[PDB]
């Protein structure tokens, strides 16, 4: 029997249809209750010869634990997060559909679902997640995803140990799609709110003291991820960066999410910023302060990462142009979007000039640091300090 597409279509469309019925309800509480009923229905039809395209490995969907889903706000087109149980197979075109079996860290959720699930005992059992957004255009997020993948490939090609975490995007319709969330990480906001610690203090408690391998490793990951996302934010002009859309994983990396405002997305800021990526006192303290080795490493990585990116600029630029041809999104605004993008690769600069540029940009990213208001007055008065 050949792989049929109608089952998959109807599966994807059922997840979308569920959102339309959620949209009829005013409050999260009510949407949540509705969602539980909806997912129960879904399981009548499972297991089936259907898949989550975001898995990136062959598998069949066996179960959607109806109690574990989450509505994410009270908006008219409110997204919802589902957990989806699958059984991995090697060969999908030749594997038959699994037989049915009768009836807050990620790690905890994986544990509780596995124990409640009739399939949880299977060695090929895997839990995936998706956020279904049945009334949002994700083509900009998809563009970002594509650019991030390309930069990752570039940095690997050029042996630059920058670290980012692209997260998978599916564009369904013009104003609908799905996202695989980054699961093994919590927002900085929440890390701070719960622990009531500074990031430095959190690392010292969570990983270890200054002389521990664990601290040094976490610090390295933080620096490598900060540098990666600094270049991402600059090249793509990602806006709206706050502690709610920066996550921290258990290894010490940061992960930026929600690339809503990118490139020429309105509104433009009026504060002469090079980037919306800002390097706070808290961040710098993690890196051992302004004259730390790890801060110097951060600036070296930014230089090498930018050297690498411009060496392969066309690969990045093509992705953007293809998207711009294919559709007219908010992030585009005629020829200038591409022009401005190309200029941010600084093709005309020598490496000495790039290094001076990186010092300037890094200094720029720290403008909001309180010390900077204190010790900047030589630029605003005839005093030399
Ligand atoms: Mg002066």
GROMACS .gro file of C-alpha atoms and ligand atoms in nm:
model
  386
    1UNK     CA    1   0.000   0.000   0.000
    2UNK     CA    2   0.140   0.346  -0.096
    3UNK     CA    3   0.158   0.645   0.141
    4UNK     CA    4  -0.178   0.825   0.102
    5UNK     CA    5  -0.199   1.202   0.144
    6UNK     CA    6  -0.568   1.250   0.229
    7UNK     CA    7  -0.523   1.104   0.586
    8UNK     CA    8  -0.241   1.349   0.653
    9UNK     CA    9  -0.438   1.643   0.507
   10UNK     CA   10  -0.738   1.559   0.724
   11UNK     CA   11  -0.513   1.522   1.030
   12UNK     CA   12  -0.349   1.863   0.979
   13UNK     CA   13  -0.688   2.019   0.902
   14UNK     CA   14  -0.844   1.869   1.218
   15UNK     CA   15  -0.583   2.051   1.429
   16UNK     CA   16  -0.676   2.373   1.247
   17UNK     CA   17  -1.050   2.308   1.283
   18UNK     CA   18  -1.007   2.266   1.659
   19UNK     CA   19  -0.868   2.620   1.679
   20UNK     CA   20  -1.166   2.764   1.492
   21UNK     CA   21  -1.399   2.617   1.757
   22UNK     CA   22  -1.178   2.749   2.040
   23UNK     CA   23  -1.205   3.093   1.879
   24UNK     CA   24  -1.580   3.096   1.952
   25UNK     CA   25  -1.512   3.103   2.328
   26UNK     CA   26  -1.416   3.424   2.520
   27UNK     CA   27  -1.199   3.285   2.803
   28UNK     CA   28  -0.898   3.050   2.833
   29UNK     CA   29  -1.081   2.844   3.094
   30UNK     CA   30  -1.359   2.771   2.845
   31UNK     CA   31  -1.119   2.719   2.552
   32UNK     CA   32  -0.919   2.478   2.768
   33UNK     CA   33  -1.228   2.272   2.851
   34UNK     CA   34  -1.330   2.266   2.484
   35UNK     CA   35  -0.978   2.161   2.381
   36UNK     CA   36  -0.988   1.856   2.609
   37UNK     CA   37  -1.311   1.737   2.445
   38UNK     CA   38  -1.167   1.805   2.100
   39UNK     CA   39  -0.850   1.602   2.160
   40UNK     CA   40  -1.052   1.312   2.302
   41UNK     CA   41  -1.236   1.299   1.964
   42UNK     CA   42  -0.906   1.305   1.778
   43UNK     CA   43  -0.795   0.983   1.952
   44UNK     CA   44  -1.097   0.794   1.816
   45UNK     CA   45  -0.908   0.800   1.485
   46UNK     CA   46  -0.564   0.705   1.623
   47UNK     CA   47  -0.334   0.534   1.562
   48UNK     CA   48  -0.341   0.626   1.192
   49UNK     CA   49  -0.110   0.656   0.889
   50UNK     CA   50  -0.046   1.023   0.976
   51UNK     CA   51   0.251   1.223   1.100
   52UNK     CA   52   0.363   1.550   1.255
   53UNK     CA   53   0.577   1.707   0.976
   54UNK     CA   54   0.786   1.881   1.248
   55UNK     CA   55   0.919   1.547   1.384
   56UNK     CA   56   1.208   1.517   1.136
   57UNK     CA   57   1.204   1.136   1.175
   58UNK     CA   58   0.967   0.874   1.030
   59UNK     CA   59   0.687   0.773   1.270
   60UNK     CA   60   0.309   0.737   1.309
   61UNK     CA   61   0.087   0.932   1.548
   62UNK     CA   62  -0.060   0.698   1.811
   63UNK     CA   63  -0.210   0.928   2.077
   64UNK     CA   64  -0.276   1.290   2.178
   65UNK     CA   65  -0.305   1.296   2.562
   66UNK     CA   66  -0.621   1.503   2.582
   67UNK     CA   67  -0.565   1.638   2.937
   68UNK     CA   68  -0.212   1.771   2.878
   69UNK     CA   69  -0.282   2.041   2.618
   70UNK     CA   70  -0.265   2.416   2.688
   71UNK     CA   71  -0.441   2.722   2.550
   72UNK     CA   72  -0.192   3.008   2.553
   73UNK     CA   73  -0.404   3.325   2.575
   74UNK     CA   74  -0.759   3.470   2.558
   75UNK     CA   75  -0.721   3.618   2.207
   76UNK     CA   76  -0.992   3.570   1.943
   77UNK     CA   77  -0.748   3.354   1.743
   78UNK     CA   78  -0.573   3.200   2.044
   79UNK     CA   79  -0.300   2.939   1.983
   80UNK     CA   80  -0.282   2.611   2.170
   81UNK     CA   81  -0.004   2.371   2.256
   82UNK     CA   82  -0.043   1.996   2.218
   83UNK     CA   83   0.174   1.702   2.307
   84UNK     CA   84   0.166   1.420   2.052
   85UNK     CA   85   0.275   1.061   2.111
   86UNK     CA   86   0.443   0.888   1.817
   87UNK     CA   87   0.622   0.559   1.750
   88UNK     CA   88   0.939   0.596   1.546
   89UNK     CA   89   1.000   0.361   1.256
   90UNK     CA   90   1.290   0.329   1.012
   91UNK     CA   91   1.103   0.282   0.686
   92UNK     CA   92   0.768   0.462   0.672
   93UNK     CA   93   0.661   0.350   0.324
   94UNK     CA   94   0.705  -0.016   0.432
   95UNK     CA   95   0.619   0.004   0.805
   96UNK     CA   96   0.255  -0.080   0.881
   97UNK     CA   97   0.053   0.138   1.118
   98UNK     CA   98   0.097   0.038   1.487
   99UNK     CA   99  -0.183  -0.164   1.644
  100UNK     CA  100  -0.404   0.028   1.888
  101UNK     CA  101  -0.358  -0.053   2.258
  102UNK     CA  102  -0.672   0.010   2.476
  103UNK     CA  103  -0.682   0.270   2.754
  104UNK     CA  104   0.675   2.213   3.507
  105UNK     CA  105   0.985   2.089   3.315
  106UNK     CA  106   0.959   1.904   2.986
  107UNK     CA  107   1.117   1.612   3.174
  108UNK     CA  108   0.825   1.603   3.418
  109UNK     CA  109   0.569   1.618   3.135
  110UNK     CA  110   0.746   1.339   2.948
  111UNK     CA  111   0.742   1.130   3.267
  112UNK     CA  112   0.373   1.181   3.351
  113UNK     CA  113   0.255   1.122   2.994
  114UNK     CA  114   0.470   0.813   2.945
  115UNK     CA  115   0.330   0.658   3.266
  116UNK     CA  116  -0.034   0.733   3.174
  117UNK     CA  117   0.001   0.616   2.813
  118UNK     CA  118  -0.079   0.264   2.688
  119UNK     CA  119   0.209   0.311   2.438
  120UNK     CA  120   0.453   0.456   2.692
  121UNK     CA  121   0.630   0.123   2.748
  122UNK     CA  122   0.737   0.094   2.383
  123UNK     CA  123   1.111   0.157   2.311
  124UNK     CA  124   1.023   0.350   1.994
  125UNK     CA  125   0.780   0.577   2.182
  126UNK     CA  126   0.854   0.950   2.149
  127UNK     CA  127   0.674   1.260   2.269
  128UNK     CA  128   0.662   1.563   2.040
  129UNK     CA  129   0.503   1.905   2.081
  130UNK     CA  130   0.350   2.164   1.849
  131UNK     CA  131   0.181   2.499   1.889
  132UNK     CA  132  -0.110   2.527   1.651
  133UNK     CA  133  -0.182   2.883   1.535
  134UNK     CA  134  -0.496   2.878   1.319
  135UNK     CA  135  -0.511   3.258   1.280
  136UNK     CA  136  -0.153   3.386   1.249
  137UNK     CA  137   0.073   3.430   0.945
  138UNK     CA  138   0.399   3.244   1.014
  139UNK     CA  139   0.576   3.315   0.683
  140UNK     CA  140   0.809   3.567   0.852
  141UNK     CA  141   0.887   3.310   1.124
  142UNK     CA  142   0.954   3.065   0.840
  143UNK     CA  143   1.190   3.309   0.674
  144UNK     CA  144   1.375   3.347   1.005
  145UNK     CA  145   1.389   2.970   1.046
  146UNK     CA  146   1.547   2.937   0.698
  147UNK     CA  147   1.802   3.213   0.764
  148UNK     CA  148   1.891   3.064   1.104
  149UNK     CA  149   1.948   2.721   0.949
  150UNK     CA  150   2.172   2.879   0.684
  151UNK     CA  151   2.381   3.074   0.937
  152UNK     CA  152   2.418   2.757   1.145
  153UNK     CA  153   2.544   2.577   0.834
  154UNK     CA  154   2.779   2.866   0.754
  155UNK     CA  155   2.926   2.877   1.104
  156UNK     CA  156   2.974   2.498   1.098
  157UNK     CA  157   3.134   2.513   0.754
  158UNK     CA  158   3.374   2.781   0.881
  159UNK     CA  159   3.438   2.612   1.223
  160UNK     CA  160   3.302   2.902   1.427
  161UNK     CA  161   3.153   2.765   1.755
  162UNK     CA  162   2.854   3.001   1.764
  163UNK     CA  163   2.535   2.833   1.890
  164UNK     CA  164   2.173   2.895   1.796
  165UNK     CA  165   1.851   2.690   1.810
  166UNK     CA  166   1.632   2.730   1.498
  167UNK     CA  167   1.279   2.607   1.577
  168UNK     CA  168   1.065   2.439   1.312
  169UNK     CA  169   0.783   2.629   1.138
  170UNK     CA  170   0.500   2.496   0.919
  171UNK     CA  171   0.312   2.743   0.702
  172UNK     CA  172  -0.034   2.605   0.635
  173UNK     CA  173  -0.248   2.888   0.493
  174UNK     CA  174  -0.165   3.257   0.455
  175UNK     CA  175  -0.279   3.312   0.814
  176UNK     CA  176  -0.226   2.973   0.977
  177UNK     CA  177   0.060   2.745   1.080
  178UNK     CA  178   0.239   2.534   1.340
  179UNK     CA  179   0.555   2.570   1.552
  180UNK     CA  180   0.767   2.311   1.729
  181UNK     CA  181   0.844   2.496   2.058
  182UNK     CA  182   1.184   2.476   2.224
  183UNK     CA  183   1.094   2.254   2.514
  184UNK     CA  184   1.409   2.211   2.725
  185UNK     CA  185   1.423   2.580   2.831
  186UNK     CA  186   1.244   2.849   3.035
  187UNK     CA  187   1.215   3.225   2.974
  188UNK     CA  188   1.465   3.449   3.153
  189UNK     CA  189   1.166   3.628   3.305
  190UNK     CA  190   1.051   3.306   3.470
  191UNK     CA  191   1.403   3.194   3.570
  192UNK     CA  192   1.450   3.523   3.755
  193UNK     CA  193   1.096   3.535   3.895
  194UNK     CA  194   1.117   3.184   4.046
  195UNK     CA  195   1.478   3.183   4.166
  196UNK     CA  196   1.482   3.551   4.270
  197UNK     CA  197   1.852   3.535   4.173
  198UNK     CA  198   2.066   3.724   3.927
  199UNK     CA  199   2.168   3.518   3.625
  200UNK     CA  200   2.522   3.496   3.761
  201UNK     CA  201   2.396   3.373   4.097
  202UNK     CA  202   2.164   3.129   3.924
  203UNK     CA  203   2.455   2.981   3.726
  204UNK     CA  204   2.664   2.955   4.041
  205UNK     CA  205   2.383   2.769   4.220
  206UNK     CA  206   2.252   2.568   3.927
  207UNK     CA  207   2.580   2.464   3.762
  208UNK     CA  208   2.852   2.522   4.020
  209UNK     CA  209   3.110   2.762   4.160
  210UNK     CA  210   3.376   2.949   3.961
  211UNK     CA  211   3.630   2.665   3.977
  212UNK     CA  212   3.388   2.397   3.849
  213UNK     CA  213   3.390   2.243   3.501
  214UNK     CA  214   3.010   2.280   3.512
  215UNK     CA  215   3.027   2.657   3.562
  216UNK     CA  216   3.292   2.701   3.293
  217UNK     CA  217   3.092   2.487   3.048
  218UNK     CA  218   2.768   2.678   3.115
  219UNK     CA  219   2.949   3.007   3.078
  220UNK     CA  220   3.095   2.893   2.746
  221UNK     CA  221   2.751   2.793   2.618
  222UNK     CA  222   2.604   3.123   2.731
  223UNK     CA  223   2.877   3.318   2.549
  224UNK     CA  224   2.853   3.109   2.230
  225UNK     CA  225   2.474   3.144   2.224
  226UNK     CA  226   2.484   3.518   2.308
  227UNK     CA  227   2.726   3.574   2.022
  228UNK     CA  228   2.515   3.368   1.780
  229UNK     CA  229   2.195   3.558   1.868
  230UNK     CA  230   2.374   3.892   1.865
  231UNK     CA  231   2.459   3.827   1.498
  232UNK     CA  232   2.110   3.693   1.427
  233UNK     CA  233   1.944   3.999   1.579
  234UNK     CA  234   2.175   4.233   1.385
  235UNK     CA  235   2.163   4.063   1.045
  236UNK     CA  236   1.783   4.007   1.055
  237UNK     CA  237   1.707   4.323   1.258
  238UNK     CA  238   1.497   4.124   1.503
  239UNK     CA  239   1.307   4.363   1.729
  240UNK     CA  240   1.115   4.341   2.058
  241UNK     CA  241   1.378   4.160   2.269
  242UNK     CA  242   1.273   4.114   2.634
  243UNK     CA  243   1.314   3.858   2.911
  244UNK     CA  244   0.983   3.699   2.806
  245UNK     CA  245   1.114   3.598   2.463
  246UNK     CA  246   1.465   3.495   2.561
  247UNK     CA  247   1.482   3.141   2.701
  248UNK     CA  248   1.756   2.967   2.899
  249UNK     CA  249   1.822   2.595   2.865
  250UNK     CA  250   1.974   2.356   3.117
  251UNK     CA  251   2.316   2.372   2.946
  252UNK     CA  252   2.344   2.753   2.984
  253UNK     CA  253   2.254   2.861   2.629
  254UNK     CA  254   2.009   3.142   2.555
  255UNK     CA  255   1.750   3.096   2.280
  256UNK     CA  256   1.571   3.391   2.122
  257UNK     CA  257   1.215   3.327   2.010
  258UNK     CA  258   0.940   3.519   1.831
  259UNK     CA  259   1.088   3.688   1.528
  260UNK     CA  260   0.769   3.887   1.465
  261UNK     CA  261   0.937   4.220   1.392
  262UNK     CA  262   1.227   4.156   1.148
  263UNK     CA  263   1.401   4.342   0.866
  264UNK     CA  264   1.174   4.635   0.768
  265UNK     CA  265   0.892   4.546   1.012
  266UNK     CA  266   0.697   4.846   1.143
  267UNK     CA  267   0.741   5.041   1.361
  268UNK     CA  268   1.101   5.153   1.309
  269UNK     CA  269   1.275   5.256   1.633
  270UNK     CA  270   1.383   5.617   1.669
  271UNK     CA  271   1.666   5.567   1.921
  272UNK     CA  272   1.960   5.511   1.684
  273UNK     CA  273   2.000   5.143   1.777
  274UNK     CA  274   2.223   4.918   1.568
  275UNK     CA  275   2.022   4.622   1.697
  276UNK     CA  276   1.746   4.532   1.943
  277UNK     CA  277   1.993   4.283   2.093
  278UNK     CA  278   2.099   4.449   2.417
  279UNK     CA  279   2.374   4.323   2.644
  280UNK     CA  280   2.271   4.393   3.006
  281UNK     CA  281   2.476   4.419   3.324
  282UNK     CA  282   2.331   4.085   3.430
  283UNK     CA  283   2.450   3.924   3.104
  284UNK     CA  284   2.793   4.086   3.119
  285UNK     CA  285   2.829   3.968   3.482
  286UNK     CA  286   2.773   3.610   3.368
  287UNK     CA  287   3.063   3.660   3.123
  288UNK     CA  288   3.295   3.771   3.405
  289UNK     CA  289   3.252   4.148   3.358
  290UNK     CA  290   3.377   4.399   3.101
  291UNK     CA  291   3.740   4.277   3.106
  292UNK     CA  292   3.671   3.905   3.154
  293UNK     CA  293   3.827   3.640   2.931
  294UNK     CA  294   3.475   3.516   2.848
  295UNK     CA  295   3.366   3.866   2.740
  296UNK     CA  296   3.675   3.886   2.517
  297UNK     CA  297   3.579   3.544   2.379
  298UNK     CA  298   3.229   3.680   2.309
  299UNK     CA  299   3.378   3.961   2.096
  300UNK     CA  300   3.615   3.725   1.915
  301UNK     CA  301   3.316   3.501   1.828
  302UNK     CA  302   3.118   3.796   1.699
  303UNK     CA  303   3.409   3.888   1.471
  304UNK     CA  304   3.466   3.536   1.340
  305UNK     CA  305   3.092   3.480   1.302
  306UNK     CA  306   3.058   3.800   1.098
  307UNK     CA  307   3.365   3.710   0.891
  308UNK     CA  308   3.203   3.374   0.818
  309UNK     CA  309   2.860   3.520   0.737
  310UNK     CA  310   2.989   3.769   0.483
  311UNK     CA  311   3.207   3.502   0.320
  312UNK     CA  312   2.876   3.325   0.240
  313UNK     CA  313   2.648   3.631   0.223
  314UNK     CA  314   2.476   3.531  -0.103
  315UNK     CA  315   2.340   3.209   0.052
  316UNK     CA  316   2.163   3.418   0.318
  317UNK     CA  317   2.048   3.691   0.080
  318UNK     CA  318   1.902   3.446  -0.173
  319UNK     CA  319   1.671   3.294   0.091
  320UNK     CA  320   1.532   3.640   0.165
  321UNK     CA  321   1.484   3.741  -0.199
  322UNK     CA  322   1.303   3.416  -0.280
  323UNK     CA  323   1.064   3.480   0.010
  324UNK     CA  324   1.014   3.844  -0.104
  325UNK     CA  325   0.933   3.735  -0.461
  326UNK     CA  326   0.695   3.461  -0.343
  327UNK     CA  327   0.491   3.691  -0.113
  328UNK     CA  328   0.444   4.050   0.006
  329UNK     CA  329   0.494   4.037   0.384
  330UNK     CA  330   0.513   4.327   0.639
  331UNK     CA  331   0.888   4.275   0.683
  332UNK     CA  332   0.950   4.379   0.317
  333UNK     CA  333   0.939   4.732   0.170
  334UNK     CA  334   1.069   4.729  -0.188
  335UNK     CA  335   1.438   4.718  -0.283
  336UNK     CA  336   1.565   4.883   0.036
  337UNK     CA  337   1.506   4.575   0.255
  338UNK     CA  338   1.757   4.371   0.054
  339UNK     CA  339   1.994   4.667   0.017
  340UNK     CA  340   2.000   4.733   0.392
  341UNK     CA  341   2.049   4.360   0.453
  342UNK     CA  342   2.348   4.337   0.218
  343UNK     CA  343   2.507   4.645   0.376
  344UNK     CA  344   2.492   4.476   0.718
  345UNK     CA  345   2.744   4.223   0.581
  346UNK     CA  346   3.003   4.502   0.544
  347UNK     CA  347   3.149   4.348   0.226
  348UNK     CA  348   3.381   4.648   0.168
  349UNK     CA  349   3.549   4.629   0.512
  350UNK     CA  350   3.885   4.471   0.585
  351UNK     CA  351   3.907   4.242   0.891
  352UNK     CA  352   4.082   4.517   1.090
  353UNK     CA  353   3.785   4.746   1.016
  354UNK     CA  354   3.537   4.468   1.104
  355UNK     CA  355   3.709   4.429   1.441
  356UNK     CA  356   3.669   4.803   1.509
  357UNK     CA  357   3.307   4.772   1.399
  358UNK     CA  358   3.246   4.483   1.641
  359UNK     CA  359   3.393   4.691   1.927
  360UNK     CA  360   3.155   4.971   1.828
  361UNK     CA  361   2.850   4.742   1.806
  362UNK     CA  362   2.932   4.565   2.134
  363UNK     CA  363   2.971   4.904   2.306
  364UNK     CA  364   2.643   5.006   2.141
  365UNK     CA  365   2.464   4.696   2.279
  366UNK     CA  366   2.555   4.807   2.636
  367UNK     CA  367   2.415   5.162   2.608
  368UNK     CA  368   2.132   5.085   2.851
  369UNK     CA  369   2.375   4.980   3.126
  370UNK     CA  370   2.347   5.235   3.408
  371UNK     CA  371   2.724   5.296   3.417
  372UNK     CA  372   2.692   5.409   3.052
  373UNK     CA  373   2.468   5.707   3.145
  374UNK     CA  374   2.721   5.788   3.421
  375UNK     CA  375   3.038   5.770   3.211
  376UNK     CA  376   2.928   5.896   2.869
  377UNK     CA  377   2.921   6.274   2.921
  378UNK     CA  378   3.235   6.350   2.717
  379UNK     CA  379   3.017   6.295   2.406
  380UNK     CA  380   2.750   6.542   2.524
  381UNK     CA  381   2.961   6.823   2.678
  382UNK     CA  382   3.291   7.005   2.617
  383UNK     CA  383   3.432   6.823   2.922
  384UNK     CA  384   3.678   6.543   2.834
  385UNK     CA  385   3.513   6.323   3.098
  386LIG    MG1  386   3.350   6.639   2.560
   0.00000   0.00000   0.00000
